[PDB]
């Protein structure tokens, strides 16, 4: 209802303009409005939704990391007692980030996932669900940390199961899902061996399927394969 008076097509058009202008908060609000029109999203529209929120939350995560590092240093032995300001401001950014994640998860639950029947859309949305629970997990410290982690795991796992049955090993969504689930294992679940095994198997199975692809699809798939390789090089 924030965007309730604007046409769906105008919201999509403005999301594209906002992307060009690097106005990602606007882009996300336009795409939220488009989702709330109640129609399913096309492939291009799903990518616009993902780009918008990834850039918004990406800035929040980077800021949270800067502030958390300062806060940790302030809590080292020998640090001069500053007041509550670093914690207060880290908490402010954290609450904002959590709100963005909750907004995305809300769109997925009402009602993107339940209407998504094709593999490409359902895997995309379940990957997104895993990603935004993962971002919640990065800042979680309380009673629900374990349940947040399990929610990320469960979403990624359902997406993996579908992708393995319904998509070729080079499919970019499948590859990006596996990349991110492998990061979840390494950074969130304290499972570096699972992370490495998943990245290696994903890379090798994609390599063996490249021969089936056109030049343009080959370019798309090898770009994400390189990210798997980059992580394996960091981790081994």
């Amino acid at each position: 209802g924030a965007m309730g008076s604007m046409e769906r097509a105008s919201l999509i058009q403005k999301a594209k303009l906002a992307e060009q202008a690097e106005r990602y908060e606007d882009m996300a609000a336009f795409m939220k409005g488009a989702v709330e029109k109640g129609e399913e999203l096309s492939c291009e529209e799903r990518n616009l939704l993902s780009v918008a929120y990834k850039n918004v939350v990406g800035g929040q995560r980077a800021a949270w990391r800067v502030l958390s590092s300062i806060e940790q240093k302030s809590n080292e032995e020998g640090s001069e007692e500053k007041g509550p300001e670093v914690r207060e401001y880290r908490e402010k950014v954290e609450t904002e980030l959590q709100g963005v994640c909750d907004t995305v998860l809300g769109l997925l639950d009402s009602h993107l996932i339940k209407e998504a029947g094709d593999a490409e859309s359902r895997v995309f949305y379940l990957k997104m669900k895993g990603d935004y629970y993962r971002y919640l997990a990065e800042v979680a410290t309380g009673d629900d940390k374990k349940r947040i982690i399990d929610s990320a795991r469960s979403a990624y796992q359902e997406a993996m199961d579908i992708s393995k049955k319904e998509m070729p090993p080079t499919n970019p969504i499948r590859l990006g899902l596996a990349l991110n689930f492998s990061v979840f294992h390494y950074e969130i679940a304290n499972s570096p061996e699972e992370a490495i095994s998943l990245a290696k198997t994903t890379f090798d199975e994609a390599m063996a399927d490249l021969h089936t692809l056109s030049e343009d699809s080959y370019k798309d798939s090898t770009l994400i394969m390189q990210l798997l390789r980059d992580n394996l090089t960091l981790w081994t």
Binding site: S50, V51, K54, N55, G58, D131, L175, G176, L179, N180, V183, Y186, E187, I224, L227, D230, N231, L234, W235
Partner: peptide, 9 residues
């Protein structure tokens, strides 16, 4: 360093 995820940026 922090590991790479997709999409980037």
């Amino acid at each position: 360093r922090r590991p790479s995820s997709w999409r980037q940026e």
